[PDB]
């Protein structure tokens, strides 16, 4: 029976099959060292004698799993044969222990497990909440609001986006309760289903998204002058977020931060306006970082007239996106999440790419 | 509490609160009838000196649950209180509402549960899901993860699955009918109400598929099918075998295999006698997958694009990571809109798709 790394454990003094690639290998003639590495790891393997092909070359190892607390995993597999299925014909261009070949590597490679990992929360949570997952080609996810009342959607925006869109909402701030108790999921399904590659990258966990630190963005630009020294301009920047993120860290200890009430003239003609200015829309920042961004949407047909000539553009222009809203669409709000991003501060990694496959 | 129109039949002689939407209304004096549609169906709601708002209009319903075997569920809700929460201006004519009808959706709902089973199974076997920028970079990720799948368009909605260290093509057929059940299983399991909406005929136990050679299908769609096919087989020669396979195996499936190496790209394991390790599935006559195991030897590959005249130095990009042993691996892709349209019965591809 095939074994991965991962369970080798409970075979100690047994016959196993393994199938992986060859991640390195130590030619001492009688005696062979070779590292092989599955989905799940690597292992040890001894053999000797053998003509052995190159690294990277795609092996089928058969023998007995003994004890080593030296080797990887504290395991070892002494071969009794090794069939290589697909001998790799030239020495890898950087020594792997080029994406389409270093990408192969355990820490290469974990981010984009650990995302699949986080998708997977993502889309469970919400199922549960009765969500339905939609496949559109910001205006039709709020006409499948209207279909649906509650939906979301995973797709590229190049970045992966995880978007939300609920409807019969109080205000923005069931967005914010909703994403807290989503990304808790998320997280949760990384931890269970992805342990290993969290550890393996030696990322240290974030602190638990709930109850997260609400701040205006009234309220965070006066920090950033009054007690950053930081010149606030227009709107948020890199660099404002990311000094209120270390603010936050400090102040709550808390890695993330909800900035709230945006100035009417920075969120789109779509955002409920509020009266004092603001809008009821929300930036999540996650150690320092933009993670999401969103809000509660203008339901009233009337309304979206009036705000769209308070932003010098032609309605006229809009007639097709006004349309559905002339048919009772519910009050509603969404957000959409940075899927890399997230990834990215949640696993300490240098940049985005590092999240993304072949950026 | 909010209550959803299916659940209704656990709280007859209690106060529930509905949300949704104004499916039709008449007034009668006094007192009017209304249909409140929310997204798990439609209850019909008595009111009384209520202003009726255009139909379309959302609106919160607090009332009484009663019986009434004269009333779509059997039961109805004698509203309290009512309030519009959105007005609705114009009448009702295009699809940014006509899609919001129980049938109009019902095909959408069943296939975010046949996607919710595709991934479901898939993980649970250990697959890794993917996000690409194509059949290079799931083929390059086979390398990385050993089995991953991506669902996203390519216009149409693509599943798409890849795997490695396998035997043959045949792991794939085989991986592919457990899959499927899995899916219809999701749907039937989460989504049987629109199922039932629609009236569509479950098909045949996705299990032990018929599989048939391209040769053989040629032989019968020819000679006992009456039809002059050609080297590719077209939607009408498709269709044939579909009621071929029907009748003789009483399935609603086909596995058609072997096709022959010219019709089928540069990358795709090739048999001496000519055919290739590919196939494609026909499920109520119509192609809902292929796939096949691919060449994963370098010097292979460069064979197969002279064969085919094909100019390797154009390929050089292709080729790189076909020199750093990629194990024997193949895929296929399942139309997901396809499958429903067939699977619910549906007229059109575009009815299972939200915008056309």
Same mark, same amino acid.
């Given at each position: 029976m095939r074994v991965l790394v991962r369970d080798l454990k409970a075979h100690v003094g047994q016959e196993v099959e393994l199938l992986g690639f060859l991640?390195?290998?130590? *030619?001492?003639?009688?005696?062979?060292?070779? !590292? $092989?590495?599955?989905?799940?790891?690597?292992?040890?393997?001894?053999? #000797?004698?053998?003509?052995?092909?190159?690294?990277?070359?795609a092996l089928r190892v058969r023998g007995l799993v003994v004890e080593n607390a030296?080797?990887?995993?504290?395991?070892?597999?002494?071969?009794?044969?090794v069939e290589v299925l697909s001998p790799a014909l030239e020495p890898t261009p950087?020594?792997?222990?080029?994406?389409?070949?270093?990408?192969?590597?355990?820490?290469?490679?974990?981010?984009?497990k650990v995302q699949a990992a986080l998708v997977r929360g993502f889309r469970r949570y919400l199922d549960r909440q009765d969500f339905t997952e939609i496949f559109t080609p910001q205006l039709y996810k709020?006409?499948?609001?209207?279909?649906?009342?509650?939906?979301?959607?995973?797709?590229?925006?190049?970045?992966?986006?995880?978007?939300?869109?609920?409807?019969?909402?109080?205000?923005?701030? *069931?967005l914010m309760r909703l994403e807290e108790a !989503? $990304?808790?999921?998320?997280?949760?399904?990384?931890?269970?289903?992805? #342990?290993?590659?969290?550890?393996?990258?030696?990322?240290?966990?974030?602190?638990?998204?709930?109850?997260?630190?609400?701040?205006?963005?009234?309220?965070?630009?006066?920090?950033?002058?009054?007690?950053?020294?930081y010149p606030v301009g227009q709107d948020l920047s890199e660099e404002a977020e990311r000094l209120?993120?270390?603010?936050?860290?400090?102040?709550?200890?808390?890695?993330?931060?909800?900035?709230?009430?945006?100035?009417?003239?920075?969120?789109?003609?779509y955002t409920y306006p509020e009266e004092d200015g603001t809008t009821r829309s929300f930036d999540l920042l996650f150690r320092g970082l933009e993670i999401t961004s969103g809000g509660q949407r203008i339901h009233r047909y009337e309304e979206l007239l009036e705000s769209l000539k308070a932003k010098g553009?032609?309605?006229?222009?809009?007639?097709?996106?006004?349309?559905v809203f002339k048919y009772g669409m519910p009050p509603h709000g969404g957000f959409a999440i940075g899927a890399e991003r997230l990834t990215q501060k949640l696993l300490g990694l240098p940049n985005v790419r590092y999240a993304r496959a072949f950026p």
């Open positions: 991640h390195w290998r130590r *030619d001492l003639g009688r005696i062979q060292f070779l !590292l $092989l590495r599955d989905r799940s790891g690597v292992v040890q393997v001894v053999t #000797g004698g053998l003509k052995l092909p190159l690294p990277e070359s030296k080797a990887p995993g504290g395991l070892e597999v002494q071969a009794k044969e950087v020594e792997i222990p080029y994406r389409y070949v270093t990408l192969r590597g355990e820490k290469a490679r974990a981010p984009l709020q006409i499948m609001v209207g279909v649906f009342e509650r939906v979301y959607e995973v797709a590229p925006v190049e970045y992966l986006s995880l978007d939300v869109e609920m409807g019969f909402i109080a205000d923005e701030e *069931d !989503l $990304l808790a999921e998320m997280l949760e399904e990384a931890l269970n289903t992805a #342990g290993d590659e969290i550890r393996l990258l030696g990322a240290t966990w974030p602190s638990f998204p709930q109850d997260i630190p609400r701040l205006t963005h009234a309220e965070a630009k006066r920090i950033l002058k009054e007690e950053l020294g209120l993120g270390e603010y936050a860290k400090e102040r709550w200890g808390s890695d993330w931060l909800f900035v709230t009430r945006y100035p009417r003239s920075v969120r789109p003609f553009m032609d309605p006229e222009a809009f007639h097709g996106y006004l349309e």
